[PDB]
């Protein structure tokens, strides 16, 4: 009953993610829908520039580590790669279950691939990658994790993510089970665990959440996401939320934005009737 | 050849502005111009605030002062308030013009009103209002002030311009004369001195530039623009820009901040032939 947001303006436009989360009111409608907000403020920030990454990732983690127990967190970002800063430290060091929410599976290593962090993130947090990462950020066993709204991989991406073991579901999968079922899967599987659920724009239709990194056609509908965050806030598992990749440059009258907060309420309670 | 770019995040979400500006690629663009530039970063900001605008605009105004002689300063900003402390600075005790193109005159004092401050930074420039800020920013003489694509005024306004004996291009004017035959007018009735010009977005019609803070119908056409800042360029008096009021949360896909940059490109030499 008491909520932190944190953020992390990174972006190594994305970086603008925090400040339209915010205009976008998230704070007053969490307060609105009973709970007692502390705005913690942004975390400072300075292949492609991974020390500078894991730096501002790790101030991040720190201060999650930190916070009172019993306080629910939500990270406003740019990058995804935020996540691992974020999932591992809001894990409080317990064995934690992870929805990835993306359209990505953000799971490469530099050995699948582009070259930039935020589409390594998962990855590491699953203890696969670069060591300067692996060792200070890894978080979960990859039997843990549950991608979901995916609809686009690499093919190294698709190996590791076999090898590995991860469940994936991927937009066949929401065509075919529809949400409703996609959703009670995923607590099955996580069973018992807090859950840290990571909400990537870019898993909307772009139609609907223009304002993002990397669009990709067929995404989860308006109605389809609130379902999902319903769902999974009636377990009374979720524990941390994670809200990346919104763009502003390339929003529109910044609703990409609004359509998380409004995603972010849904999964802390907020109820139609 | 040498060019300063600083921002203000004020507020008081124009906040964002400055970085809209920014990845609307101003720097870059400048330099393929054939300037070299330099992001000098954001001045620090954090009836209402009167204190805390006049601590960021006398560190706006005091910085560019401080600027070595021959250097050309672009305020990116937010708020319109931010051009009490820049005109002043950006002027360094010499005599200036001031060609104001907003579609709001900002001429108001405490007595004719909105009570925002953002709306009183011509009329504090000219000398009239809340003594806190005339007495550090008061820098030009009415008889030295054009307002150019009004279409928005108070009636204490229109009382106060009168008196003080502003010229005064409305949008009506607009429509009769031309951008044409009003910019040799600006030019020569602010003949002699350097120049410094002032950018409202809503300046711009609201259908071409959607994002600034209060839009008003019937404005000046990407080609007018254009125009103006090509006269007023050849002039070769212009000596610095204020590029404001450039919100993002209402903007579409950032083309208001890409239409700014567009417009400072043409204030600074550059053309199609």
């Known amino acids: 009953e008491r909520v932190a947001v944190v953020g992390v303006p990174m972006d190594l436009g994305v970086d603008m993610g925090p400040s339209a989360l915010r205009y976008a009111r ?5 307060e609105d829908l009973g709970y007692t907000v502390e705005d913690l403020g942004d975390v400072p920030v300075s292949l ?8 501002a990732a790790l101030v991040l983690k720190e201060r999650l580590a930190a ?3 019993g306080v629910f967190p939500i990270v406003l970002g740019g990058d995804h790669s935020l996540s691992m800063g974020s999932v591992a430290g809001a894990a409080r ?5 992870v929805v990835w929410v ?6 490469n290593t530099p050995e699948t691939s582009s070259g930039n962090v935020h589409g390594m993130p998962l990855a590491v947090l699953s203890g696969l990658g670069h060591p300067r990462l692996t060792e200070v950020f890894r978080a979960v066993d990859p039997k843990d994790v549950v991608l ?4 686009s991989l690499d093919p190294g ?6 090898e590995a073991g991860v469940r994936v579901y991927t937009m066949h999968e929401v065509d075919r089970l529809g949400v409703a079922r996609i959703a009670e899967e995923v607590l099955k599987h996580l069973q018992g665990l807090p859950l840290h659920v990571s909400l990537d724009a870019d898993v909307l239709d772009p139609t609907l959440a223009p304002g993002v990194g990397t669009p990709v056609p067929g995404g989860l509908t308006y109605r389809e996401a609130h379902l999902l965050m319903e769902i999974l806030a009636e377990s009374g598992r979720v524990q941390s939320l994670d809200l990346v990749e919104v763009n502003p440059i390339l929003d ?3 609703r990409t934005a609004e359509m998380l907060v409004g995603l972010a309420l849904s999964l802390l309670g907020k109820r139609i009737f």
């Open 102 to 107: 993306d359209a990505h599976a953000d799971f």
């Open 252 to 254: 529109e009258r910044n």
């Open 157 to 162: 991406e698709k190996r590791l993510l076999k």
């Open 26 to 30: 998230l704070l007053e409608q969490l």
């Open 48 to 55: 492609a520039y991974l020390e500078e990454i894991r730096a």
């Open 67 to 69: 916070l009172p127990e």
């Open 93 to 97: 060091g317990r064995r934690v279950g």
């Open 148 to 151: 979901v709204g995916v609809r």
